[PDB]
Structures are given as structure tokens and as C-alpha cells.
Amino acid sequence: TLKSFTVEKGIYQTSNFRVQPTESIVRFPNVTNLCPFHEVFNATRFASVYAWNRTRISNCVADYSVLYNFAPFFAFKCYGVSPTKLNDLCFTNVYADSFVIKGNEVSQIAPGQTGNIADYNYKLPDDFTGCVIAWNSNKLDSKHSGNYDYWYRLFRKSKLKPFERDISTEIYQAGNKPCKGKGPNCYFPLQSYGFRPTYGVGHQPYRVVVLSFELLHAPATVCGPKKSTNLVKNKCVNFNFNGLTGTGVLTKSNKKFLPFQQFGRDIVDTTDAVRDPQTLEILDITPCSFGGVSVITP
């Protein structure tokens, strides 16, 4: 500091000393409200592809990792952001889709694809940000007589557009003459499936959740779920409480907060106190000891 090799007598100022932290503490609120997609993924009956249910998912915490183990999804294709980024943006008005389609058809549910189902039944846009998931359903969507309860569109005098649904049942015209009833070139534009438990792999019914989900933006942002760790006291730690981030020592306090308050502030700005979202206890935050490291030499 003195820029010399001959230090005279005295007390010379020098660098500063700080007590660096040693642990990291993250305490997000109790994890209470989450959606039982159990109703969305573990139902007895789903809808036909021509009348696909745009299932609404809202106001809950995203916990579908159990469906990783309970339901072995053989198909999982995400054309949008990576799942690891899903914590940065959550969804409130997000849509979900429930499909019951054939086996050699999951490849047709993809952006830029063509075919009967893609053109007449369900069309995805080129810029599709979502995940397709499918799984076999022989044990609960096939019958010896035949599951004559799932339908799909075959004829239509136009092409579809992204996110369009049609329920029309009017007969389809194929010739010049005007039409009243079936008979001649006037076909009914609805045909059902014939699922049986002993079909081949390419013809067995696949329960296909085309999670064509997005609709992230909204005044509300019900979020994915956050991990919490334990709490450490009387030690220098780096803390993150509901987005308030800092460093210091968290000791027991005796301030009497009001039931609607979260933080506390001193006479200037500093976050003197805080309230833990889970155990609901006042905790005083005191900053880490720091100062000068002055040197005395003769």
C-alpha cells in the first residue's frame, strides 16, 4: 500500500475484512394448491378427436412428475422452450387437449405435417410451442365387441386452420345436383373407430394428450412448484424469502407483526425483519460483521 520497502513507525490503514457466507437458504411459501390433473390424466372416458376437449388448467401448482412414474409416457416431444425454463414463466389460462386416436398417427400430430387428421380433424401451427405425449390404452380403451364411441372427421370441403373445432353434422356434397339425405354421392362426414384389444401395435388406440399448452401471459401467473430447503439460524447465510434476496444472520425476534404483513423496514430502507412463510415466525436479519484490518508496526 505504501509503495515502499521502508515502513516507518505508526498505524497504517490497509484492506478490509468481511465474514463470507457459508450456506444458502431458500424458503418459498407452503406448497398447498396444485391441480389434480388426476382428473385430466386418470379419467375413465375421453373425447373424440373431432370433438376434442380443450381442457382448462388453472389456479394451481404444476406437479406432473408423478405422472412420469405412474404413467410411462412413451411419447414426449416438446417443440417450444426447454422444460428447464418452465420455472421462469408459468401459466394461468393454459389450455390442454385430450385425444383418442389410432397408433400410426402420433407422427401426424407434429408441426408442418400432413394427412387426414392433420388436415380435417386437428391442425397445429408451424410455430407450435407445446409437448405431445401419447401412451397405449389397450387395457382401458379397447373392447372385444368394439369401442364404437370415438369418432373422427373424414370429409370436408375445405382445409382447417390452427386451433379450430368443428361439430357440424350436415351431409357432404360431392356432385352438382342439390342434396337431401344420403343415397347417391352424398356421404355422412362422421365415421367411428373399431378398437379391439387384439389389434396390432399400429392400430391399437393411443390416449394422446397433445399438450398444445401455452397461454402463459395473464394478469395472474399460477406457477410451477418451487423447492424449499431447511432453515439455519445464528449463522451467516445467503437467504431468499419470496424473492427478497440478501445475506446475513437470522435470529429470533419479538416484533409483533400484523397478520397481513410480510417484511419489515427500518428508518431508511433496509430489510431489518422478515417473516418465514411456513412456520410464521418473526426473524430478525442482522448484517455480517465487517470492518478494517489495520496494522501496527514499530
Partner: protein, 217 residues
């Protein structure tokens, strides 16, 4: 309908921060001191929030309806505090003009006539409410001080935040749902609030009323 004055009523907690024995100079939407208050089923405008006071004994007040046009083409907010739990429903309800029930029964919610999308739902003596709407959030603050007497008490009461909601709709006209009340309109101002040992607001001073209440600020 008549016109009266509000002595020092309408002061609420601006934020969820605890402060102990201090004086805070803040800027926010408030009801100016000694402003003109309408004393009262007409439709009233909604300029950057409203302050609603009610005094009754027969419990004729049952809720509120909010919207921009109430034409069943834009989302409308209905709040009904029927008897035990408050219902908040946000959609294009086709409300009737005059929802009134004789007098027991406690049924027949024929206030609306049709249903629609209906995204959001929620359940849970001188009643004072502040309704504010900002940043796509609807904030409802309330206070219930049992009146000792029958006149209007010129006194100080801070309003704790009852609920904050991400309804995310637009509102320009608000009405009242029956089975005396006071309506006031908010404005941007700067206030000085006093905090006791216990993060309670005990006194407030405006900064645009009088020469004294500018030197104080």
C-alpha cells in the same frame, strides 16, 4: 341524494411492509381530506378507484357489480356476500336491472339471466370499503368499526387489505346490489402517515389541504 364532507376518512395501508414508530411520506391514490361525498339505483362512474361506506341494520346491501359497459359483451365482476361466504365471479353475467327479493328462504339468485366463459371464481355497522384497480389487479380493503351511537363519527380508522386479486379485467361503471350509503372518488395525492410501536396507522396528514399541512410534510 345529498352532499357531505369526509373529515379524515379513507386512509389505508399502502403496502405490506411493517414499520415501527415512524413517519412515512408516501404518494398514492387516496380520498382527499374534506372532499365532497355523495350521500344516498343509478349507475356511478369509476375514476381510479372508489370509496364506499355503508350504515344499515336491516342488511339490505348484498354486493356489487362492476364493468365497462355491462352489455354481456365484456367481462363483468360480481361480488355477493349472501349470508355466510362471499362469492366472487368474473364473467359476462346477463344481470337483471333490479335484483330484489321480498323479505326465511335465502335462495333465488336470479340476478343474472345467462352464463358464459366465467374464468375466475373465488370463495372465502359503518362498513367501509376501498376498491382500487391498478396493474391488472383488483384490490379490496375493508374495515368494520361498530358504531357507538347513530351519527357519523369523525374519527380515524386505517383499512386493512381484505383481498388482492388478479382478475385482470377492465371496469368503468359500478352499481350497487340491494336485497344508507356513501360514495367518494379517489385522486393522486401525497400523505404523511404515523406508525405506532405496532405498525398501526394512528394519524394521517395531507400535503395539499392547508399551509400548515405542507410545512408538516
Amino acid at each position: 341524494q345529498s352532499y357531505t364532507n369526509s373529515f379524515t376518512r379513507g386512509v389505508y395501508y399502502p403496502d405490506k411492509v411493517f414499520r415501527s414508530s415512524v413517519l412515512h411520506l408516501t404518494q398514492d391514490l387516496f380520498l382527499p381530506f374534506f372532499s365532497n361525498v355523495t350521500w344516498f339505483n343509478p349507475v356511478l362512474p369509476f375514476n381510479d378507484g372508489v370509496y364506499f361506506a355503508s350504515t344499515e341494520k336491516s342488511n339490505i346491501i348484498r354486493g356489487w357489480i362492476f364493468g365497462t359497459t355491462l352489455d354481456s359483451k365484456t367481462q363483468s365482476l360480481l361480488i355477493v356476500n349472501n349470508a355466510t361466504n362471499v362469492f366472487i365471479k368474473v364473467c359476462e353475467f346477463q344481470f337483471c336491472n333490479d335484483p330484489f327479493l321480498d323479505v326465511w328462504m335465502e335462495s333465488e339468485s336470479g340476478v343474472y339471466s345467462s352464463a358464459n366463459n366465467c374464468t375466475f371464481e373465488y370463495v372465502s355497522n359503518l362498513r367501509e370499503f376501498v376498491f382500487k384497480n391498478i396493474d391488472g389487479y383488483f384490490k379490496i380493503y375493508s374495515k368494520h368499526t361498530p358504531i357507538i351511537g347513530r351519527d357519523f363519527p369523525q374519527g380515524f380508522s386505517a383499512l386493512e387489505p381484505l383481498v388482492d386479486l388478479p382478475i385482470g379485467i377492465n371496469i368503468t361503471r359500478f352499481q350497487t346490489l340491494l336485497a344508507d350509503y356513501y360514495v367518494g372518488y379517489l385522486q393522486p395525492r401525497t400523505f404523511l402517515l404515523k406508525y405506532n410501536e405496532n405498525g398501526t396507522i394512528t394519524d394521517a396528514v395531507d400535503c395539499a389541504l392547508d399551509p400548515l399541512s405542507e410545512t408538516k410534510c
